Symmetry: D2
Subunit: 427 residues, 4 copies
């Protein structure tokens, strides 16, 4: 037939696992032959998933740390890279609130269709590709890498291990670079800073992490796998079967049949250590922005897994000035990086930037009409010194690029967009 997409042999995969330092501390409870048996006759190449994953892994070891902001539209991701950020965080919370495939506004409880986050991954890459295409024809070299890696939210898997497997597969097809997975009961998933959280036994989350790795292996991409634990605040567990969880089981039971468990940094350390061999980065949800507790978690984990990188949630669910002074806020991220928190991200940055900017505009617009918008347009003009370009909105969305396509197909076409527009004649 054709040699396109021929699967590699179990020997090559074993070779790659043995020699490539990317897999230096990755445990696999399945064999390389098990991967081959699940790949059929053709293995689709996932370019953006591979490139982003390799770029992400590289940046986590080159840069002091990799920091990101939550993005829920393609334009958001474009502006984050344009501004200098090297990675995009794809928040599930935000998807639930304003960008999921049901069309409804949801709280962060795994209510939306399971393929919603993959579509936002694809959408973001599409927008970054368009920005990359525009920069090439415009000769704009302000950004070295427009295809910045995407770290996406796997939540609690939307079911069992097969649901996990299919979500990770869908995230890779969309071109994700990393995905994170939490140890909550899928049917009761909550945001890390909401209540009513229900843990699942330690082994079950290792099962989830193993499933996430397996799909990345079957698709043949070094996807960064992130493990999140919600044990600092969760006081409910589904079962006491796992002996690793028993020291925190109180015996008390709820009407639903859940077991009460003792929460805090100790069960997070215990679970972190158990997840480490199956996680490229570890992440513990916390109740406050507190450097001491972060250092404490960092020390206990690195005392057994010294090279284990960590991720920290700089959550807008914290009232930041209520806990930290301005000076502590200024060094918060830099001090975290010294502890090994190499991926840091403001999860709901997109939500609050979108909701506040439109309220501020609409409120002024209701009182003073055009005066309020001219205020915004002038800030846009003033920001052009800093590299802002979306003021010329026609080229920002690719008017020049499609004019180039149109002239490539027909050099004498008289229906090009940017020639004659008010943009070229007023900006």
């Amino acid at each position: 037939m054709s040699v396109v997409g021929t699967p590699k042999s179990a020997e090559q995969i074993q070779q790659e696992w043995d020699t490539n330092p990317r897999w230096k501390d990755v445990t696999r409870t399945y064999s390389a032959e098990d991967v081959v048996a699940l790949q059929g006759s053709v293995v689709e190449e996932h370019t953006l998933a591979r490139r982003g994953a390799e770029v992400l892994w590289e940046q986590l070891h080159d840069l002091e740390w990799v920091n990101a902001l939550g993005a829920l539209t393609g334009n958001m991701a474009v502006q984050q890279v344009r501004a200098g950020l090297k990675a995009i965080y794809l928040s599930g919370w935000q998807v639930a609130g304003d960008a999921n495939l049901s069309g409804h506004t949801y709280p962060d409880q795994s209510l939306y269709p399971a393929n919603s986050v993959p579509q936002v991954v694809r959408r973001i890459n599409n927008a970054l590709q368009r920005a990359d295409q525009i920069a090439k024809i415009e000769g704009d070299t302000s950004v070295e890498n427009w295809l910045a890696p995407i770290v996406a939210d796997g939540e609690a898997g939307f079911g069992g291990a097969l649901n996990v497997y299919e979500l990770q597969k869908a995230l890779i097809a969309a071109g994700v670079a990393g995905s994170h997975w939490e140890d909550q009961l899928a049917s009761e998933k909550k945001c890390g800073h909401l209540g009513g959280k229900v843990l699942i036994p330690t082994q079950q989350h290792i099962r989830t992490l193993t499933s996430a790795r397996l799909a990345a292996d079957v698709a043949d991409v070094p996807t960064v796998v992130i493990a999140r634990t919600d044990a600092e605040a969760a006081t409910l567990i589904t079962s006491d079967v796992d002996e690793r969880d028993q020291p925190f089981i109180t015996g008390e039971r709820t009407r639903e049949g859940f077991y009460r468990t003792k929460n805090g940094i100790e069960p997070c350390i215990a679970r972190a250590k158990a997840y480490a061999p199956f996680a490229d980065l570890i992440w513990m949800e916390t109740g406050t922005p507190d450097l001491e507790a972060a250092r404490q978690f960092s020390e206990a984990v690195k005392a057994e897994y010294p090279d284990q990188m960590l991720a920290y949630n700089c959550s807008p669910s914290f009232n930041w000035k209520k806990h930290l002074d301005d000076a502590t806020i200024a060094k918060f991220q830099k001090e975290l990086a010294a502890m090994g928190f190499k991926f840091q991200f403001i999860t709901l940055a997109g939500f609050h930037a979108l909701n506040y900017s439109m309220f501020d505009l609409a409120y002024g617009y209701a009182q003073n009409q055009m005066s309020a918008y001219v205020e915004l347009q002038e800030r846009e003009f003033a920001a052009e010194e800093r590299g802002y370009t979306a003021t010329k909105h026609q080229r920002e969305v690719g008017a020049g690029y499609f004019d180039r396509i149109a002239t490539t197909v027909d050099p004498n076409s008289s229906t090009t967009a940017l020639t004659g527009s008010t943009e070229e004649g007023q900006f």
Copy 2:
């Protein structure tokens, strides 16, 4: 027997409504009431939000000094606009093309995206307003009397022929649109009004479009507001010279494609506006500058033949406002326009610029000072609570308390509610 739910009206009932309801006092239909019924089948679905929105919109356009709106490309965007006191929502096709269409790609405004993209955003905006209305009910919030603000959505050029026009209107009505606007451009060469290289369609062809949009609203039995837009002020090309109303502006020369070169300006806009009036609840003239004098010329000339005709005006971000106008004129702009008959006024790309600038300003500061940049935003949100802002408590803004209410309604003793013990409960 058989269920009578959704039994269609008779032809005589429709004719009585057309004859006596003042909504249709100036609406011309070249088809009959029996034609409408003939297309409705055995069951006519109710479109609650499209009906409510259309009625509220029409009432507001006659009761308020003028209705104004801002472009919205996400559900949360519309929530804040209504929360801030706005009484209508404009759904830009430009914004949908650039950051919210079903292809997943970023497109310029050239009718490149799938034809059902805007309807999806109509349904999304309504869903988001319904969630804010639900939350408001359980929170005792009465700061907004009508959360379900009318939506005016961009129908562009119909994505093809009359049948493409019809299905787009039907899909917008099914999603709950209050009004839709249609422009006299060649769909295969559609452009934003302030882009170059526009190709007009013949006047009679856009009367076909407006007639098809009205027909789709009638078959669906909702009084959708039909808005006619003309791009004749800047377009120098037209597909054909077949319409005698267009011929006086044609020069005679043709392009290699076969298009006819035509003379643009306000004069062909007035002519097309007069021809569209019997089929348009609102008329909209795309212009190259924000000019009150030019707006008055178009208004007086149109109202001379149809004095009750309402107009619409695009306060376009494509205009460099302070380059053309002083601050005093900017402050009175919409007010002066309202006196001329421009009763619906909108900023098309308000959402694109608010979204792109806010995220850039945050990411720029975040790239240099990390958390110090975000705390500034959070502190601004805290400060905006005096003006009525609420999204700082993001958990309840998206309905965590509402779904907690659903959960406890099913199981009052559930121990897995979301807001209970949340960091929002204890820190905000």
Copy 3:
């Protein structure tokens, strides 16, 4: 500012519950005031959900029984109604296999996105509507009701109570007439005739049926709620918390923490008795198609609730010529109806009809090329005297209907479809 979609008061709802015989045997653990508190300021009308639910409830008490076939495309439902069936069944198995929003082929384990089945409900209603429209312009009264009630698969709700609520809401928005919900763990969901099934406690499914009724009440439509139990084959359960399930707990455990339980018709009778106050119909999956086993379940349930209607799956997963003789197969549904099984359905009928007919045609096409297809078309021609109409495929999908729209907008259009078509000149 309008009164469209104004919610009813709690007293009005409570009065409907107290007097409308539709709710005669319906237990609601929540209050009428709870329903109102969740409805915001506007309640959208769900015309097809209301009509379908009403028609369904009417047919279950007026006809000897209501039989259906699984359909996964719009055209399938059209042909089912065309051939004389009064109800459509929407299999979740079939959606997982060949019609879900992931684009992938899935076994029946709740792997596809949760809004997949609603989309097919909307699709089926859309296709039935088109046939209804086509029949009107064609003067075809051979079918009384093209909008046959749809009974859709809710699986295990795709999570907790709130996931159940949203699926029911979406099914209603899409126009479903009824939905069935099973007492399996959504995380490890399986087809009823698959292995490794894990039950949830009796009370957790009572909570599911409650959330399902609540979503219908908030939507103000009398959706037929069906309760399904898988305890006939399942040897696992998630917890021993419910004392109604404890008499079957063996005391063993699994590595995952599941509890071994004793399967059989006995725990199905018990769970059905518990589910009865919360189900318009009750259904137990069974390992074989057996009339006596069905009579045992029937008479046992009706011993406590003699007016409880039941549902039965004549599963394709069975092997009928193996078990039963021809004469028993003929009387099978008729005898099941006399026992109270008033809704019967063949789940995977669409899957098998689609896969076999395409294999049969593709195989013949491989050997004999055009000779194979001509056998089908002549078989299609022959079926016209039984009512079949899809041989003329252009009119079947609405070519004439859209000609009517096109001629209504522009009666002089020179670009209509059926005039000059090969269908017009070659199909008499």
Copy 4:
């Protein structure tokens, strides 16, 4: 700062056009530098679009003729390959009637959303991949290539060249092997065998074919481009600007501004010769299944382009036994293959198979209930001799394959699907 997805140089592309025999008779009015200019920094790999396009082109030259059937669902395509067919045809007609993203039933008039056919391409490929995966774990080698190439319907492009460009790009992203494009006015597009067809000028369709090729080159895949002409029955054209069309323009006009034109085989031959340098296959819609009329079209085109391959629509819109005897019906495809019609397809085969088979069952079901179904189940049993496998429906949709994924993740899983089922016990 990675190498994955690096675009190749213009001279590297120019070398493929000059040497690869795939492009021996392909005219490109744009340059290799033009292609590189539109590719940005990264070029995604479209494995299935590449593999399928290479397989299809190879089959067209190696087989007597490649024939296919219309498929509108994933399971349909699975059964077509299972029965021995080596290609899938994706009818736009069928998509409009029962599988487009609007949810509505439509006549064949370009009414549905433009990304609908790409979705079905991706869906068909997903189904074929699932059958490929199941076949691997079951040791099934009765099918050599489950990834049969897909020929998809691009209709009239849903607008201008930029619309054409985006449809071809989305089809390629979905894994298409070929796409066909017709010379109709998009806003008035009709099925070839419906009335009221309006042609666009010859040059405008060359513009379409060029745009379709450009998108395939920018995607770096050898997509098979097929040119369809509707001039046999269409008596309308939009303009008289192209002098190649004027010898058929009569001077008559319609109220809309169209031009009456003389339909027939003559303008089909002329337009075909104009499309030949821009089309890998050429396709003339006809009003009857006539072998003599096909020869005239074939020998006329091949007089100027000897190696020009042709495609023929064996349309269900023909009443076959009203025109042909059984002897001619049997040899129809074979005769066409000898004239150079190397891609032959029954467009609406899926619609009629699905609609008839369900009416036949539902009718008998409404009359004799279970007896009607057991007849179908018995015919499915008897079909196992011929290779039919969907009778065991659980494994048919991958229950066994996902059981493998489950046991690969956790060997001791108590929640496997096929063990203890009625499939392993009654089949």
